[PDB]
Design an enzyme around this catalytic site. Sequence first.
Site, mmCIF file in Angstrom:
data_model
loop_
_atom_site.group_PDB
_atom_site.id
_atom_site.type_symbol
_atom_site.label_atom_id
_atom_site.label_comp_id
_atom_site.label_asym_id
_atom_site.label_seq_id
_atom_site.Cartn_x
_atom_site.Cartn_y
_atom_site.Cartn_z
ATOM 1 N N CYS A 55 34.386 -96.046 -38.856
ATOM 2 C CA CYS A 55 33.605 -95.757 -37.649
ATOM 3 C C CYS A 55 34.200 -94.674 -36.730
ATOM 4 N N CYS A 60 30.423 -94.100 -36.931
ATOM 5 C CA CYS A 60 29.768 -94.169 -35.615
ATOM 6 C C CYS A 60 29.978 -92.991 -34.655
ATOM 7 N N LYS A 63 28.909 -89.395 -35.871
ATOM 8 C CA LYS A 63 27.480 -89.459 -36.086
ATOM 9 C C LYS A 63 26.688 -89.533 -34.761
ATOM 10 N N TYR A 196 20.409 -96.108 -43.435
ATOM 11 C CA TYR A 196 20.384 -95.553 -42.080
ATOM 12 C C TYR A 196 21.356 -94.366 -41.997
ATOM 13 N N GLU A 200 19.899 -91.028 -40.480
ATOM 14 C CA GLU A 200 20.532 -90.591 -39.248
ATOM 15 C C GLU A 200 21.052 -89.178 -39.453
ATOM 16 N N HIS A 468 10.777 -100.619 -12.800
ATOM 17 C CA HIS A 468 9.897 -99.445 -12.843
ATOM 18 C C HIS A 468 10.551 -98.289 -12.123
ATOM 19 N N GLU A 473 10.754 -101.859 -19.604
ATOM 20 C CA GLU A 473 9.831 -102.761 -18.900
ATOM 21 C C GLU A 473 8.584 -103.123 -19.695
HETATM 22 C C1 LIG Z 1 28.126 -92.791 -41.627
HETATM 23 C C2 LIG Z 1 28.379 -94.188 -41.065
HETATM 24 C C3 LIG Z 1 27.821 -94.502 -39.832
HETATM 25 C C4 LIG Z 1 28.007 -95.786 -39.213
HETATM 26 N N1 LIG Z 1 27.439 -96.028 -37.951
HETATM 27 C C5 LIG Z 1 27.660 -97.284 -37.354
HETATM 28 C C6 LIG Z 1 27.142 -97.521 -36.059
HETATM 29 O O1 LIG Z 1 26.490 -96.686 -35.385
HETATM 30 N N2 LIG Z 1 27.415 -98.790 -35.526
HETATM 31 C C7 LIG Z 1 28.147 -99.806 -36.187
HETATM 32 O O2 LIG Z 1 28.318 -100.906 -35.592
HETATM 33 N N3 LIG Z 1 28.662 -99.555 -37.440
HETATM 34 C C8 LIG Z 1 28.434 -98.326 -38.014
HETATM 35 N N4 LIG Z 1 28.994 -98.094 -39.274
HETATM 36 C C9 LIG Z 1 29.794 -99.145 -39.949
HETATM 37 C C10 LIG Z 1 31.193 -99.342 -39.348
HETATM 38 O O3 LIG Z 1 31.849 -98.074 -39.318
HETATM 39 C C11 LIG Z 1 31.963 -100.398 -40.174
HETATM 40 O O4 LIG Z 1 31.236 -101.623 -40.155
HETATM 41 C C12 LIG Z 1 33.393 -100.687 -39.642
HETATM 42 O O5 LIG Z 1 34.149 -99.467 -39.631
HETATM 43 C C13 LIG Z 1 34.062 -101.719 -40.541
HETATM 44 O O6 LIG Z 1 35.374 -102.047 -40.052
HETATM 45 P P1 LIG Z 1 36.536 -102.582 -41.012
HETATM 46 O O7 LIG Z 1 37.712 -102.858 -40.151
HETATM 47 O O8 LIG Z 1 35.993 -103.709 -41.851
HETATM 48 O O9 LIG Z 1 36.904 -101.374 -42.009
HETATM 49 P P2 LIG Z 1 37.102 -99.799 -41.861
HETATM 50 O O10 LIG Z 1 36.834 -99.398 -40.450
HETATM 51 O O11 LIG Z 1 36.366 -99.113 -42.977
HETATM 52 O O12 LIG Z 1 38.690 -99.664 -42.000
HETATM 53 C C14 LIG Z 1 39.480 -99.935 -43.171
HETATM 54 C C15 LIG Z 1 40.647 -98.953 -43.132
HETATM 55 O O13 LIG Z 1 41.625 -99.347 -44.125
HETATM 56 C C16 LIG Z 1 41.919 -98.223 -44.977
HETATM 57 N N5 LIG Z 1 42.307 -98.761 -46.291
HETATM 58 C C17 LIG Z 1 41.537 -99.022 -47.407
HETATM 59 N N6 LIG Z 1 42.221 -99.518 -48.442
HETATM 60 C C18 LIG Z 1 43.536 -99.584 -47.969
HETATM 61 C C19 LIG Z 1 44.798 -100.032 -48.574
HETATM 62 N N7 LIG Z 1 44.878 -100.502 -49.824
HETATM 63 N N8 LIG Z 1 45.928 -99.963 -47.819
HETATM 64 C C20 LIG Z 1 45.839 -99.485 -46.541
HETATM 65 N N9 LIG Z 1 44.740 -99.048 -45.874
HETATM 66 C C21 LIG Z 1 43.595 -99.129 -46.676
HETATM 67 C C22 LIG Z 1 40.676 -97.338 -44.911
HETATM 68 O O14 LIG Z 1 40.844 -96.022 -45.426
HETATM 69 C C23 LIG Z 1 40.294 -97.475 -43.436
HETATM 70 O O15 LIG Z 1 40.936 -96.535 -42.591
HETATM 71 C C24 LIG Z 1 28.798 -96.791 -39.906
HETATM 72 C C25 LIG Z 1 29.356 -96.449 -41.152
HETATM 73 C C26 LIG Z 1 29.161 -95.146 -41.755
HETATM 74 C C27 LIG Z 1 29.809 -94.884 -43.090
HETATM 75 C C1 LIG Z 2 9.984 -92.481 -2.091
HETATM 76 C C2 LIG Z 2 9.717 -93.873 -2.673
HETATM 77 C C3 LIG Z 2 10.264 -94.175 -3.910
HETATM 78 C C4 LIG Z 2 10.061 -95.449 -4.538
HETATM 79 N N1 LIG Z 2 10.623 -95.691 -5.798
HETATM 80 C C5 LIG Z 2 10.388 -96.950 -6.409
HETATM 81 C C6 LIG Z 2 10.915 -97.198 -7.699
HETATM 82 O O1 LIG Z 2 11.587 -96.383 -8.352
HETATM 83 N N2 LIG Z 2 10.625 -98.459 -8.241
HETATM 84 C C7 LIG Z 2 9.873 -99.453 -7.601
HETATM 85 O O2 LIG Z 2 9.691 -100.536 -8.207
HETATM 86 N N3 LIG Z 2 9.360 -99.207 -6.354
HETATM 87 C C8 LIG Z 2 9.605 -97.978 -5.766
HETATM 88 N N4 LIG Z 2 9.051 -97.744 -4.504
HETATM 89 C C9 LIG Z 2 8.245 -98.803 -3.857
HETATM 90 C C10 LIG Z 2 6.831 -98.942 -4.436
HETATM 91 O O3 LIG Z 2 6.170 -97.678 -4.354
HETATM 92 C C11 LIG Z 2 6.093 -100.027 -3.667
HETATM 93 O O4 LIG Z 2 6.828 -101.241 -3.806
HETATM 94 C C12 LIG Z 2 4.652 -100.260 -4.186
HETATM 95 O O5 LIG Z 2 3.919 -99.035 -4.065
HETATM 96 C C13 LIG Z 2 3.990 -101.344 -3.358
HETATM 97 O O6 LIG Z 2 2.678 -101.617 -3.855
HETATM 98 P P1 LIG Z 2 1.485 -102.058 -2.909
HETATM 99 O O7 LIG Z 2 0.335 -102.303 -3.790
HETATM 100 O O8 LIG Z 2 1.962 -103.170 -2.030
HETATM 101 O O9 LIG Z 2 1.140 -100.825 -1.943
HETATM 102 P P2 LIG Z 2 0.999 -99.237 -2.062
HETATM 103 O O10 LIG Z 2 1.307 -98.779 -3.440
HETATM 104 O O11 LIG Z 2 1.730 -98.632 -0.914
HETATM 105 O O12 LIG Z 2 -0.588 -99.068 -1.949
HETATM 106 C C14 LIG Z 2 -1.397 -99.387 -0.802
HETATM 107 C C15 LIG Z 2 -2.627 -98.467 -0.843
HETATM 108 O O13 LIG Z 2 -3.550 -98.891 0.208
HETATM 109 C C16 LIG Z 2 -3.833 -97.751 1.046
HETATM 110 N N5 LIG Z 2 -4.163 -98.232 2.393
HETATM 111 C C17 LIG Z 2 -3.343 -98.412 3.481
HETATM 112 N N6 LIG Z 2 -3.964 -98.859 4.557
HETATM 113 C C18 LIG Z 2 -5.288 -98.982 4.142
HETATM 114 C C19 LIG Z 2 -6.482 -99.414 4.831
HETATM 115 N N7 LIG Z 2 -6.451 -99.803 6.112
HETATM 116 N N8 LIG Z 2 -7.668 -99.424 4.136
HETATM 117 C C20 LIG Z 2 -7.665 -99.020 2.829
HETATM 118 N N9 LIG Z 2 -6.614 -98.598 2.092
HETATM 119 C C21 LIG Z 2 -5.423 -98.605 2.847
HETATM 120 C C22 LIG Z 2 -2.593 -96.872 0.926
HETATM 121 O O14 LIG Z 2 -2.688 -95.597 1.521
HETATM 122 C C23 LIG Z 2 -2.345 -96.959 -0.570
HETATM 123 O O15 LIG Z 2 -3.136 -96.064 -1.343
HETATM 124 C C24 LIG Z 2 9.262 -96.456 -3.852
HETATM 125 C C25 LIG Z 2 8.718 -96.128 -2.598
HETATM 126 C C26 LIG Z 2 8.932 -94.837 -1.987
HETATM 127 C C27 LIG Z 2 8.302 -94.582 -0.646
#
Ligand SMILES: Cc1cc2nc3c(=O)[nH]c(=O)nc-3n(C[C@H](O)[C@H](O)[C@H](O)COP(=O)(O)OP(=O)(O)OC[C@H]3O[C@@H](n4cnc5c(N)ncnc54)[C@H](O)[C@@H]3O)c2cc1C
Ligand SMILES: Cc1cc2nc3c(=O)[nH]c(=O)nc-3n(C[C@H](O)[C@H](O)[C@H](O)COP(=O)(O)OP(=O)(O)OC[C@H]3O[C@@H](n4cnc5c(N)ncnc54)[C@H](O)[C@@H]3O)c2cc1C
Lengths: 495, 491, 105, 105
Positions: A55, A60, A63, A196, A200, A468, A473
């Site tokens: 890895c 890992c 890659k 994979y 990958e 959101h 979500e």
């Molecule tokens: C291309 C590729 C991509 C991968 N991507 C992922 C990933 O994204 N996520 C994930 O969770 N896993 C991934 N894996 C798998 C992961 O790398 C292995 O599951 C993990 O390395 C296994 O750990 P290990 O300790 O069993 O053996 P290894 O990490 O293989 O280690 C064994 C070590 O012992 C050495 N050895 C062998 N024989 C002897 C000996 N007789 N004496 C002394 N040393 C020896 C080896 O050369 C090696 O260095 C990937 C594998 C490959 C090939």
């Molecule tokens: C800059 C900013 C960033 C935000 N970022 C996030 C975020 O990342 N994630 C998150 O979960 N929340 C975020 N929020 C909060 C989110 O927008 C509010 O929680 C959500 O809009 C509330 O929903 P609501 O239906 O209560 O009212 P609103 O969405 O405010 O809608 C009420 C509607 O009724 C209208 N209205 C008002 N008075 C009247 C009336 N008298 N008659 C008729 N219509 C009327 C309004 O003008 C509006 O169109 C953010 C808010 C702001 C200001």
Amino acid sequence: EDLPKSYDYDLIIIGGGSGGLAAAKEAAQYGKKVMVLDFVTPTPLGTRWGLGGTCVNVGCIPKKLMHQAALLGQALQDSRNYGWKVEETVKHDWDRMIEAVQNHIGSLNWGYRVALREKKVVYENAYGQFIGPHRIKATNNKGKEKIYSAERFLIATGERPRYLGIPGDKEYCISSDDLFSLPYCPGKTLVVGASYVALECAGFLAGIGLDVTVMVRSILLRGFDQDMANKIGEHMEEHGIKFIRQFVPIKVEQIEAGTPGRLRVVAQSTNSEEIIEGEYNTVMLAIGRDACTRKIGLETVGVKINEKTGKIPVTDEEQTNVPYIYAIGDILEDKVELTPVAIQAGRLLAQRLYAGSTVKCDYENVPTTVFTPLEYGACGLSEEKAVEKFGEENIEVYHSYFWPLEWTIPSRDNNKCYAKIICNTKDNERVVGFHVLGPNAGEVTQGFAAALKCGLTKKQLDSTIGIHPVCAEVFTTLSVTKRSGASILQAGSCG
Amino acid sequence: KSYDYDLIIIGGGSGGLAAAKEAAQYGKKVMVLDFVTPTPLGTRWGLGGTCVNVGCIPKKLMHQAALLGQALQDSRNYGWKVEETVKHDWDRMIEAVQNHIGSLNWGYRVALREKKVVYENAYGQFIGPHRIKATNNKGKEKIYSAERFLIATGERPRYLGIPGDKEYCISSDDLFSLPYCPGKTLVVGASYVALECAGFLAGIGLDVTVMVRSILLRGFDQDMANKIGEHMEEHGIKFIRQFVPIKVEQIEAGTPGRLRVVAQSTNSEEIIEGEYNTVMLAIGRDACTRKIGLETVGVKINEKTGKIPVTDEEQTNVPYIYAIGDILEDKVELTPVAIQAGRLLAQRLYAGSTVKCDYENVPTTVFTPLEYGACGLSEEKAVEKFGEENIEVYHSYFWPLEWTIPSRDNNKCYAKIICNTKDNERVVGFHVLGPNAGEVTQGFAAALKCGLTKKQLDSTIGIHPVCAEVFTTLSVTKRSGASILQAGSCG
Amino acid sequence: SVKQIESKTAFQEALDAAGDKLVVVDFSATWCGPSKMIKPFFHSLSEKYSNVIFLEVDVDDCQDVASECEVKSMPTFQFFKKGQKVGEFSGANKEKLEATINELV
Amino acid sequence: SVKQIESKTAFQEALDAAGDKLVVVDFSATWCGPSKMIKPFFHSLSEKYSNVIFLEVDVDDCQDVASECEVKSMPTFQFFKKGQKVGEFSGANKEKLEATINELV
Ligand SMILES: Cc1cc2nc3c(=O)[nH]c(=O)nc-3n(C[C@H](O)[C@H](O)[C@H](O)COP(=O)(O)OP(=O)(O)OC[C@H]3O[C@@H](n4cnc5c(N)ncnc54)[C@H](O)[C@@H]3O)c2cc1C
Ligand SMILES: Cc1cc2nc3c(=O)[nH]c(=O)nc-3n(C[C@H](O)[C@H](O)[C@H](O)COP(=O)(O)OP(=O)(O)OC[C@H]3O[C@@H](n4cnc5c(N)ncnc54)[C@H](O)[C@@H]3O)c2cc1C
């Protein structure tokens, strides 16, 4: 006499990868004298690397980094619409990238030697090989052997890339092991496989601008929800990649040598006898990996394996048949071949043995993410696996598409990102499967795997308020089931 | 039925629209009244509510504009021959954002037509029992009646009440569609609105300043709040604490121009003045629950906040007048909430459902230069509610793998969880500061609805290599005092 | 000229090849940015002080030396007085560097 | 060129003062990409048919009109000859457009 009057180490770890290193640091946390043996035998073309395991060196890390290189390509385009004066098309430099990646790996190879020195763990760059009870034979690069002894021993050798066994492969074909540090830009590339690893890699190569092709034997991502697997394949093809299904190479021939050269690949259909040949600059084999459990003498000590897969059968406590010989990682039989797993297994096995802990490693519902052009994250059972285990009449599948807000201004790829959950009707609509196809799939899947360890149900899910505006979500409001048949395809920007 | 409709919704925002679509899903005759009274400078917008027009959508998009700026820099290290420094065009961006909003406005009008829910761009306003008075832009009034009525008017930006503000000061309501690049900007406030905006403006290359009365993000874990402020400061955003402007003077009119602020120390009397091109007020929002006549119908509110007290079923004192969204009293003012509330209130009333809306542990994310996601209790709130001796806080830093090649910002991303010792180390609080904070927090909020505990968490296998996996192995507690400051590239 | 030691053998042996001379060691890493930035200077610094003995150690080409010495960050400079570790610091602070070869000449 | 309509009166009533000379109605939006993409073609196509009177209805300015004509997306074209909807399609397909005009002349 035979058995050593005393043991050099309380424990010796054969393999310096994900599992072995986490286990060493843990055992040593309780004082114990430990030694790790790590040697990386070269690939057919001579490529080798430092400490850290698969890895860290050829898996890992490199890659995901290259995946990020491709994602940045898409970001460069997406920026113009958000008002950034980017050129229409930017060029990419293969060498610049490889150097940067090798620089990070290098920093990690180093970080690990230090951490071992920190916990006072003996690191030896030698090839370990059992010779008898509590005895092992290490062989450094020069050839200087030496025998050691330890109260206990841990096998953690991991695996290596597997070859076709056909004429021309081991000589003109690179494996993932070579790709990550290739001295030249690959060019026209033919990826062989559909694991994979294959997709990958095929994926990011296409992302930096290379002509990529993928030759598939049978299906795609064998072992993953197929509905998802194909949505992925479909996407890759949509984004440039060419696929050749039901085919397999039989011979490779060098047209010209070069950095890169040119190769010819002869291939034969899976069933028919129809055969075709193409010309490529580079050919990669991502057809599977093989456990390093044979050429390390286990018979001399007694540990029994699987004569055909090479996998090692162990108890839920990781112990093999011999009471002092444990094993973890990829080489394990019917487990999860993922880095975090091997690491969880390693840290626990050490606590039971030296801390008093009695906690076992959970191989149930481990989450995973495939880093294809469009990321895919999963956790739990697949759809096909759910019907089989619970009966089609108790499996409710809730799904929906979604359009990342970040993709609306660049105005691209609507109705591609897909989400779905498998629910067990006979168990309070328990969520037994989780699948998401889209941006940051992994960041999304993590928390949901914890929800699954808490037995999440549809009602509980529906009761959770989404954040959101964020992709994830979508899972908090799924109402359309596959059974009902309603359309889930959403309208575009213009209605 | 001596009733025009079965229900009338006053407010076409997040809540009102979700409620209308739901009720109409069961046939019922519904009508939504939406009118957006202009801002002091004449700005206004279409249907969809706050979040769609002047909130979430435009703000996250502009946040993405700044993120892309950082991505442009980061590609070089990955091997992309990006030109030196790239320029950013304000207008190009505003146009693109407005184009997407315009699109949402239309999807909402079409969506409403589909479910057969009468839409009227008219300012509704009660006059008596089951009766309301709508007033379109032209001035043509009309009274309607419905068996039930739903208030969902949301809020609006609040002003300082000082000389020069309503004339030279813009609120978030104006920013998202400003006709010209803002330039030298002074942001007044410290709400998430203030910092999110101050944040992306700085991201596209503008000189941004923020004047804070006292503290940042009141209502949020303060330990996190300051980690955020500290980060913004390290990335340009200049601050000014303990101050509040007393009057604004126009040095000149312009597109933009040159303004001059006058502020006085909160704790003292010292006064200072600065010169800015644009001044934004993000000091709070006020419920639109006064100028809409509730007395004529009876609904009782809070004479000072404007909030509307309701039953856990959203009903106000009058049995046919419900209410949801921001205007509600002591609830959570977020779009998803208002929407969950709206879809449920409709099912109870017309579907038979008896499910109530959960205002407990709602997750949130603030989109600052470095995103922050949270769910559950804050640290300070945990000790208070459970006693310091039962609150174990597990934390750790982390360095996004994607940042190592660009080699930037190590030991900035921070993660932490609050655990209740007395309840099986139940996770009562969740906090994360870093990339994609929201995508990370979502699933963990579901875990919290399932009563997640430390043991269960430790038992979950992280996904590698991904940021979120940090939460699956937290072992260092604040109590123990161990260092969590990891190491840099060279070691 | 600085000696690019290739072995802990040529290391402990070189530490000796220097009589009363001060042994200044440069623990470097090709993958470390500040490490390569201060490198050229170490080279032109090795000359200005042809009386002190300049040694270089690429933590990878011979990790068995950096291992002993207890190096943790790059760049790292360690000073020796006929075998005994006298001086030592980290970072590509060149001023600090030369000002150490002085102080402990 | 093209008569920009901004009223329900300038529509439901002016769809008369034209007579029988086919009148193609263009429902568009200042925010829809393809809506604009075909705008020039529509305006430069108006100069290419006198026996046909071109009308452009902005969905936002004339909300009353777009919903009163059952408009779902942009660009949406509808054809009339004496208040009768004898043609209607969606999308920025230029051929289908001039084709629908030449086949309902
Ligand atoms: C291309 C590729 C991509 C991968 N991507 C992922 C990933 O994204 N996520 C994930 O969770 N896993 C991934 N894996 C798998 C992961 O790398 C292995 O599951 C993990 O390395 C296994 O750990 P290990 O300790 O069993 O053996 P290894 O990490 O293989 O280690 C064994 C070590 O012992 C050495 N050895 C062998 N024989 C002897 C000996 N007789 N004496 C002394 N040393 C020896 C080896 O050369 C090696 O260095 C990937 C594998 C490959 C090939
Ligand atoms: C800059 C900013 C960033 C935000 N970022 C996030 C975020 O990342 N994630 C998150 O979960 N929340 C975020 N929020 C909060 C989110 O927008 C509010 O929680 C959500 O809009 C509330 O929903 P609501 O239906 O209560 O009212 P609103 O969405 O405010 O809608 C009420 C509607 O009724 C209208 N209205 C008002 N008075 C009247 C009336 N008298 N008659 C008729 N219509 C009327 C309004 O003008 C509006 O169109 C953010 C808010 C702001 C200001």
